[PDB]
Design a protein around this motif. Structure first.
Motif, short mmCIF file in Angstrom:
data_model
loop_
_atom_site.label_atom_id
_atom_site.label_comp_id
_atom_site.label_asym_id
_atom_site.label_seq_id
_atom_site.Cartn_x
_atom_site.Cartn_y
_atom_site.Cartn_z
N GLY D 143 0.80 -1.21 0.00
CA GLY D 143 0.00 0.00 0.00
C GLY D 143 0.83 1.26 0.00
O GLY D 143 0.68 2.11 -0.89
N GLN D 144 1.73 1.39 0.98
CA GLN D 144 2.56 2.58 1.18
C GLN D 144 1.70 3.84 1.24
O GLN D 144 1.96 4.84 0.58
CB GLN D 144 3.63 2.70 0.08
CG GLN D 144 4.98 2.12 0.46
CD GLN D 144 5.85 1.84 -0.75
OE1 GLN D 144 6.95 2.37 -0.87
NE2 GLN D 144 5.35 1.00 -1.65
N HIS D 145 0.65 3.77 2.06
CA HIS D 145 -0.40 4.78 2.04
C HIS D 145 -0.72 5.33 3.42
O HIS D 145 -1.80 5.90 3.62
CB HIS D 145 -1.65 4.21 1.37
CG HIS D 145 -2.53 3.42 2.29
ND1 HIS D 145 -3.88 3.67 2.43
CD2 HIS D 145 -2.26 2.38 3.11
CE1 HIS D 145 -4.39 2.83 3.30
NE2 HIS D 145 -3.43 2.03 3.73
N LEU D 146 0.20 5.20 4.38
CA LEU D 146 0.02 5.64 5.76
C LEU D 146 -1.17 4.91 6.39
O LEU D 146 -1.66 3.92 5.84
CB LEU D 146 -0.17 7.16 5.84
CG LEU D 146 0.28 7.93 7.08
CD1 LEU D 146 1.78 7.85 7.27
CD2 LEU D 146 -0.17 9.37 7.02
N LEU D 147 -1.63 5.37 7.55
CA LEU D 147 -2.80 4.79 8.20
C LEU D 147 -4.01 5.62 7.79
O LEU D 147 -4.29 6.67 8.38
CB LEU D 147 -2.62 4.74 9.71
CG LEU D 147 -1.52 3.79 10.20
CD1 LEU D 147 -1.67 3.49 11.68
CD2 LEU D 147 -1.51 2.50 9.39
N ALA D 148 -4.73 5.14 6.78
CA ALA D 148 -5.92 5.82 6.30
C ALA D 148 -7.04 5.72 7.33
O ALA D 148 -7.00 4.88 8.22
CB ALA D 148 -6.36 5.21 4.97
N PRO D 149 -8.05 6.60 7.23
CA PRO D 149 -9.21 6.47 8.13
C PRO D 149 -9.89 5.12 8.05
O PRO D 149 -10.54 4.71 9.02
CB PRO D 149 -10.14 7.61 7.68
CG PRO D 149 -9.52 8.17 6.42
CD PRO D 149 -8.07 7.88 6.50
N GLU D 150 -9.79 4.43 6.92
CA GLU D 150 -10.24 3.05 6.78
C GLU D 150 -9.00 2.19 6.53
O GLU D 150 -8.51 2.11 5.40
CB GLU D 150 -11.27 2.91 5.66
CG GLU D 150 -11.65 1.48 5.34
CD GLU D 150 -12.12 0.72 6.55
OE1 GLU D 150 -13.13 1.13 7.16
OE2 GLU D 150 -11.49 -0.30 6.89
N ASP D 151 -8.49 1.56 7.59
CA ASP D 151 -7.29 0.76 7.49
C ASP D 151 -7.25 -0.25 8.62
O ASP D 151 -7.85 -0.04 9.68
CB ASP D 151 -6.03 1.63 7.51
CG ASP D 151 -4.81 0.90 6.97
OD1 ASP D 151 -4.81 0.55 5.78
OD2 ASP D 151 -3.85 0.69 7.75
N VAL D 152 -6.53 -1.35 8.39
CA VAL D 152 -6.38 -2.43 9.35
C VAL D 152 -4.90 -2.77 9.47
O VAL D 152 -4.23 -2.99 8.46
CB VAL D 152 -7.18 -3.68 8.93
CG1 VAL D 152 -6.79 -4.87 9.76
CG2 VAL D 152 -8.67 -3.41 9.04
N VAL D 153 -4.39 -2.80 10.70
CA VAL D 153 -3.01 -3.18 10.96
C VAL D 153 -3.04 -4.40 11.87
O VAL D 153 -3.47 -4.31 13.02
CB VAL D 153 -2.20 -2.04 11.60
CG1 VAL D 153 -0.72 -2.38 11.60
CG2 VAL D 153 -2.45 -0.73 10.87
N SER D 154 -2.57 -5.53 11.35
CA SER D 154 -2.48 -6.77 12.11
C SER D 154 -1.02 -7.02 12.44
O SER D 154 -0.18 -7.12 11.54
CB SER D 154 -3.06 -7.94 11.30
OG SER D 154 -4.42 -7.72 10.99
N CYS D 155 -0.72 -7.11 13.73
CA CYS D 155 0.66 -7.22 14.19
C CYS D 155 0.84 -8.54 14.92
O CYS D 155 0.05 -8.88 15.82
CB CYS D 155 1.02 -6.05 15.10
SG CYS D 155 2.70 -6.12 15.74
#
Lengths: 126, 98, 107, 985
Positions: D143-155
């Motif tokens: 993506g390389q699109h920062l944390l958008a208002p609609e985004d999911v980060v699974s760590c």
């Protein structure tokens, strides 16, 4: 500590004698009982006639069929003989060497919770 | 260099108004640590904006009212002249009235 | 050689021309991260059109390569514009300029 | 070269204006030779506060631990408003160690508040960068699109072969933190600035994973300890909003990776007496008896066919009368119980006065066992209750047994989980017995209580056999500008949690390291035991409880301090109402309170006299006045921040002395350290952490680049310095090398296994490794295990550190022989020279500095003016700085308000903040650290230097130098000017 491996599977018509060998290599701490449990496909795992040290016989809920289960303590090996066979008997059999004997639990929760599981083996019936 | 002149124009009014209202009531924590440090920089900024001509008609009226409500009635309660001030504030206020 | 990496995605098609005013808000940084300009604190984007050379020419190239509404970085090397000698007192001589930019309201 | 002098700035501004006529040449020369560097003068700009929130989950790796290695969580973004109040909305998600990641509001390293990835304890990901050690590595995410208002980060985190991986919208992030430090408990953490809304998806009932966990990775929601519930809390908070007002909070209590390991007492090696055999038979009998009673009570039928499915009792005979495996199954109960009992200081009784014979057998016909009999030997006790010493012994034995069984499971390969499954070797009771919930505690201890009470019925002898220094007390004192030298002052301290929260008055020069009352700079009262504290501890008053408020008052006219509790004056042992008397006014006094671990106190200075309760009862009629009665703005306080920060060695330090010996001939200008009180009174031997005040900064561009050869010395890019270790000082206690400006470790007995390191392995979508760079906060040789160290000799060991600022290597040498340490760093790194030494001699170490053949001395690296000077020198800027454990830090007037709450079982916990907050940060260029501009209210040297810097700015832009004014607009911006205008503090 006590590593136990169950082996012996086959496919044949009802009434075929089946020797299922489970070897428990380790301490004699888990020699107190050799429980056996069968997982049928899509069915809750349920109990097999279990022997405690000295070949004490206790029939279980799924004891249907000839459960000729014996064991020697020299090398800690238990052989189950399925002489009889039924279409419902198709399941994966697992052996456990545990220090709690059958229906005998006066100990505390941790000592009731000592239990060693095994690989297990799928057995099919024609 | 350019800075928003209307922004400073309303900001000086608001800031010196709060300064006058905080000096009217006796407080043990003046802005900056003393009355002179509270009032002298703000009065200098207001005087500079006034001579530069940024303040409008109603803003000049507001400054006049906050200097003295009673005599300078357009037609806080304590005017900025009446309350006790140090010599630096007095000098800056004389420059303001000039 | 302005290096460009996108941060906030945008339309990706409306790149500016000569004759189009780019309304741009930017925070200028040195190569070591030392901030030396920002229009955000001035709250007016500095409203430049491409081709009048009101800007870093690398800034012009980066703005042209961007589209409307998309953050990018501009790695303006010193050889570009005043990177070699910037307004004395702001930019040290021969300093790469990082320009974190985004286009808005392209006219 | 000569340090920050406020008079050199006076010289500079006098150089600018000539008696009413400015000189443009001089003004432009100053603005072109001083301002562009941004290295001497203190920089300043506005930044946003950063606040971090974690779940109540701690997972760690240790030898024999009861916790799984693999964990996985996720955070979804709901709404982000970027660039509120002209700053990028910081938002990072990752893991963080439980010991070291303690971000405080304001301050921090570099610019802005510290979030995830700001130090080496935490590892973050903001959408397109992998943040670690305040350095961002641009990651090649799809993506390389920062944390958008609609985004999911699974760590996800695999603690075995340590690795942390991220996944944005299912796309695999091409970067992994690897080989990091396992010394601590990792927890999920989100750091954010104002204006964000995110949902924490831990899994199970606490949110639902929108993407499947990778194979082998357990969900994070099942790591909750059984004693606690899941909740969102700040990382380390000294302040928390309450009903009456803000509540000061002491240091939090945290677990450790060694706390999840079981360490039971070995009892197999314990020998047994014949007393064990004598008592064991009847104890096993009674075990069978109480159990038979339960068999009768339960559906368990009295069938001697020995069928558990038909619920049949095997024995069915009053005497145990069983086969051998059953018999020893009954006896080893008592055997192991007495082994664990005699492993402690407890003995075994032998039926004293035939107590077992005296106690009788009361059979009940109602509980008739069809096979065992009318009553299987009830063995009713003779009303022998359990002694409290016996009950503590029971819990001790219960802990032992639980730890033994947990150790067995762990050796088998079992792990703890909130939910229980058998195939995956998971248990919900595998946590140690201290962390166990109370129900399973009762289930474990029930049988042991029965055994102990049976033994007591028999004749048996009854007899029984965070927290670190400078991190246990948080000191909240009033600001040094509010010192009182006259009058009658009164202030209240509510004790929300009972304990050690010593409250009182203190001198303005209260040293934060020393506890309150242990020195002469404090007059406090410790209500944990009632003891007053001034230059020692004396009995006084009474201990307090929850809700008790102490109305501490001072009389400067009467030179007294009086403590009152709940409206009644606390009296001393002699009956005097005044706790302390004949107190010299001196410099002044300040309200102060030292809260301990897990302690909550409400300090009401008296801004709202109506909110001041009990003031009418005590203080109003006595003439006492509330502290800050007429003050409009609330009184700022200064908490004792525990962050270990380097500060210069005081000239009058009672134990350590720094000597500035002159270079002379055949010797370089060196700084030698000595221990004054060595081998005498107060000869403390502690790990001393030392560094030089000025850093060497690597080149931004990493190009391949007897008598001293002039062309080589003119083209030299390498720098050299050395450290001399004297004969008395053991070489196994010196650690020569470099430190980054992010070193904040004050642990004693330092070793290179305790350094902070992490390899940021960046890769490609296919899997090929893009880069495998390493990051560490310190680079020293292993002097403790040095081959040069290897027998006490009279020779002195000289360790040199050749550092190439262009290539990036830091090759070390010892006594001419080249050491095998070749630490290689990235460009634009600042590295203060440093040594850590454990004093074993009066002459410990010496920073020799100087040069070698074809190498600059280190002064050329530190000082730009002497860049091409090959003569070693020690300008007054260079000095030896020792690590301080704690220091005063200003409490921010307004904190970021964060609302955390769970929306439902589907959504789960959500974190929301929408109130913008900014501060002006003064940044030291050489130390790479910033603090509040309001913090300069007590640091008067920095205050004066920055005031004269502002005066220099005005003088150099004065008289219509519009070009210089335009230049100064970059250093001082419109937002900074307006915020300084509106800033009242």
């Amino acid at each position: 500590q006590v590593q136990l491996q169950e082996s012996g599977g086959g496919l044949m018509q009802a009434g075929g004698s089946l020797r299922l060998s489970c070897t428990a290599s380790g301490s004699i701490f888990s020699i107190n009982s050799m429980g056996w449990y069968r997982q049928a496909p899509g069915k809750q795992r349920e109990l097999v006639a279990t022997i405690t040290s000295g070949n004490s016989i206790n029939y279980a809920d799924s004891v249907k069929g000839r459960f000729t289960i014996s064991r020697d303590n020299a090398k800690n090996t238990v052989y189950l003989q399925m002489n009889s066979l039924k279409p419902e008997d198709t399941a994966v059999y697992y052996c456990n060497a545990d220090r709690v004997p059958n229906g005998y639990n006066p100990w505390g929760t941790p000592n009731d919770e000592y239990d060693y599981w095994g690989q297990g083996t799928q057995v099919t019936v024609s | 260099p350019a800075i928003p002149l209307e922004a400073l124009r309303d900001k000086a009014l608001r800031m010196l108004g709060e300064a006058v209202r905080d000096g009217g009531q006796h407080a043990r924590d003046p802005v900056g640590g003393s009355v002179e440090f509270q009032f002298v920089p703000v009065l200098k900024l207001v005087s500079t904006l006034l001579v530069m001509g940024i303040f409008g008609d109603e803003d000049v009226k507001q400054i006049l009212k906050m200097i003295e409500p009673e005599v300078f009635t357009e037609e806080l309660e304590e005017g900025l002249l009446q309350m006790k001030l140090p010599e630096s504030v007095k000098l800056q206020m004389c420059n303001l009235l000039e | 050689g302005v290096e460009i990496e996108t941060i906030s995605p945008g339309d990706g098609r409306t790149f500016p021309k000569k004759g189009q005013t780019c309304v741009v808000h930017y925070t200028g940084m040195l190569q070591n991260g030392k901030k030396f300009d920002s229009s955000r604190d001035r709250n007016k984007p500095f409203k430049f059109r491409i081709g009048k050379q009101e800007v870093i020419k690398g800034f012009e190239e980066g703005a042209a390569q961007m589209s409307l509404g998309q953050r990018a970085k501009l790695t303006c090397t010193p050889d570009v514009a005043y990177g070699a000698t910037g307004h004395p007192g702001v930019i040290p001589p021969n300093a790469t300029l990082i320009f974190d930019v985004e286009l808005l309201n392209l006219e | 070269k000569h340090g920050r002098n406020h008079k050199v700035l006076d010289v500079l501004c006098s150089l600018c204006v000539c008696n009413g006529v400015a000189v443009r040449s001089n003004q432009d020369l100053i603005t072109e030779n001083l301002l562009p560097g941004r290295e001497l003068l203190l920089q300043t700009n506005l930044i946003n506060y950063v606040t971090s929130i974690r779940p109540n989950i701690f997972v760690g790796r240790a030898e024999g631990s009861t916790q799984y290695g693999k964990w996985y969580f996720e955070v979804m973004v709901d709404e982000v408003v970027p660039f509120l109040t002209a700053q990028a909305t910081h938002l990072r998600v990752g893991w963080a160690l439980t010991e070291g990641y303690s971000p405080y509001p304001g301050g921090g390293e570099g610019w802005g508040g510290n979030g995830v990835g700001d130090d080496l304890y935490s590892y973050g990901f903001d959408g397109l960068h992998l943040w670690t050690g305040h350095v961002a590595r641009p990651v090649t995410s799809p993506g390389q699109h920062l944390l958008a208002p609609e985004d999911v980060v699974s760590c996800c985190l695999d603690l075995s072969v340590p690795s942390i991986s991220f996944r944005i919208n299912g796309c695999p992030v091409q970067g992994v933190f690897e080989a990091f430090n396992l010394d601590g408990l990792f927890f999920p953490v989100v750091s954010f600035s104002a204006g964000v809304k995110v949902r924490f998806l831990l899994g199970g009932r606490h949110g639902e994973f929108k993407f499947l966990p990778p194979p082998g990775y357990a969900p994070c929601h099942e790591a909750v300890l059984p004693r606690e519930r899941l909740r969102l809390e700040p990382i380390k908070e000294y302040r928390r909003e309450g009903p009456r007002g803000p509540h000061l909070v002491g240091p939090s209590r945290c677990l450790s990776h060694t706390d999840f390991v079981p360490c039971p007492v070995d009892t197999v090696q314990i020998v047994l007496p014949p007393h064990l055999e004598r008592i064991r038979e009847k104890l096993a009998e009674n075990i069978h008896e109480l159990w038979a009673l339960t068999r009768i009570e339960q559906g368990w039928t009295y069938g001697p066919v020995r069928d558990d499915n038909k619920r049949l009792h095997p024995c069915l005979v009053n005497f145990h009368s069983l086969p051998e495996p059953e018999r020893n199954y009954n006896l080893q109960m008592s055997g192991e119980t007495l082994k664990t009992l005699l492993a402690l200081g407890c003995h075994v009784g032998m039926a004293d006065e035939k107590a077992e014979d005296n106690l009788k057998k009361t059979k009940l016909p109602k509980t008739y066992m069809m096979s065992n009999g009318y009553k299987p030997a009830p063995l009713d006790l003779s009303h022998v209750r359990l002694t409290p010493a016996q009950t503590t012994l029971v819990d001790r034995l219960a802990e032992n047994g639980h730890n033994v069984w947990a150790r067995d499971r762990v050796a088998q390969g079992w792990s703890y989980s909130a939910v229980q499954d058998i195939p995956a070797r998971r248990n919900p009771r595998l946590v140690p017995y201290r962390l166990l919930d109370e129900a399973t505690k009762r289930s474990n201890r029930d049988s042991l209580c029965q055994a102990v009470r049976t033994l007591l019925g028999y004749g048996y002898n009854i007899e029984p056999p965070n927290q670190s220094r400078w991190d246990r007390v948080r000191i909240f004192r009033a600001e040094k500008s509010y010192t009182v030298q006259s009058g009658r002052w009164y202030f209240e301290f509510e004790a929300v949690t009972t304990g050690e929260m010593r409250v009182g008055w203190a001198r303005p020069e209260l040293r934060p390291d020393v506890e309150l009352g242990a020195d002469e700079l404090a007059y406090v009262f410790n209500g944990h035991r009632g003891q007053r504290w001034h230059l020692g501890s004396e009995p006084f008053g009474r201990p307090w409880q929850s809700g008790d408020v102490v109305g501490c008052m001072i009389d400067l006219t009467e030179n007294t301090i009086i403590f009152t509790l709940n409206g009644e004056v606390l009296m001393s042992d002699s009956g005097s109402e005044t706790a302390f008397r004949e107190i010299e006014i001196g410099d002044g006094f300040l309200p102060v309170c030292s809260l301990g671990p897990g302690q909550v106190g409400h300090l009401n200075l008296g801004q709202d006299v109506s909110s001041l309760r009990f003031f009418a009862i005590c203080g109003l009629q006595e003439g006492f006045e509330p502290f800050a009665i007429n003050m409009q703005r609330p009184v700022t306080t200064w908490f004792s921040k525990s962050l270990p920060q380097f500060e210069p060695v005081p000239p009058e330090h009672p134990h350590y002395e720094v000597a500035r010996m002159d270079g002379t001939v055949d010797t370089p200008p060196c700084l030698r350290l000595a221990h004054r009180t060595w081998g005498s009174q107060n000869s403390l031997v502690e790990m001393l952490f030392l560094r030089l005040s000025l850093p060497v900064q690597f080149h931004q561009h990493f190009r391949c680049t007897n008598r001293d050869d002039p062309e080589i010395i003119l083209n030299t890019t390498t720098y050299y310095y050395s450290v001399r270790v004297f004969a008395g000082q053991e070489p196994s206690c010196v650690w020569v090398g470099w430190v980054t400006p992010d070193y904040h470790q004050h642990d004693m007995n330092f070793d290179l296994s305790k350094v902070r390191a992490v390899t940021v392995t960046m890769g490609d979508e296919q899997g090929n490794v893009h880069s495998s760079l390493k990051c560490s906060n310190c680079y020293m040789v292993w002097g403790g295990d040095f081959v040069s160290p290897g027998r006490i000799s009279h020779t002195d060991l000289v360790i040199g550190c050749l550092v190439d600022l262009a290539t990036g290597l830091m090759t070390f040498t010892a006594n001419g022989k080249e050491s095998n340490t070749f630490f290689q760093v990235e460009p634009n790194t600042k590295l203060f020279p440093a040594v850590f030494v454990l004093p074993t001699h009066q002459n410990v170490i010496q920073f020799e500095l100087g040069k070698q053949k074809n190498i600059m001395p280190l002064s050329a690296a530190m000082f730009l003016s002497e860049r091409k000077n090959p003569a070693p020198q020690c300008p007054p800027r260079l000095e030896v700085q020792m690590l301080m454990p704690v220091s005063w830090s200003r409490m921010p007037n307004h904190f970021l308000q964060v609302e955390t709450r769970r929306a439902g079982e589907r959504l789960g916990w959500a974190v929301q903040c929408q109130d913008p907050l900014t501060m002006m940060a003064l940044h030291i260029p050489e130390e790479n650290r910033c603090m509040d501009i309001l913090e300069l209210s007590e640091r008067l040297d920095l205050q004066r230097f920055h005031s004269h810097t502002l005066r220099l700015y005005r003088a150099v832009c004065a008289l219509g130098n519009n070009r210089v004014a335009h230049a100064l607009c970059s250093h001082v911006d419109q937002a900074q000017l307006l915020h300084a205008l509106e800033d009242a503090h």
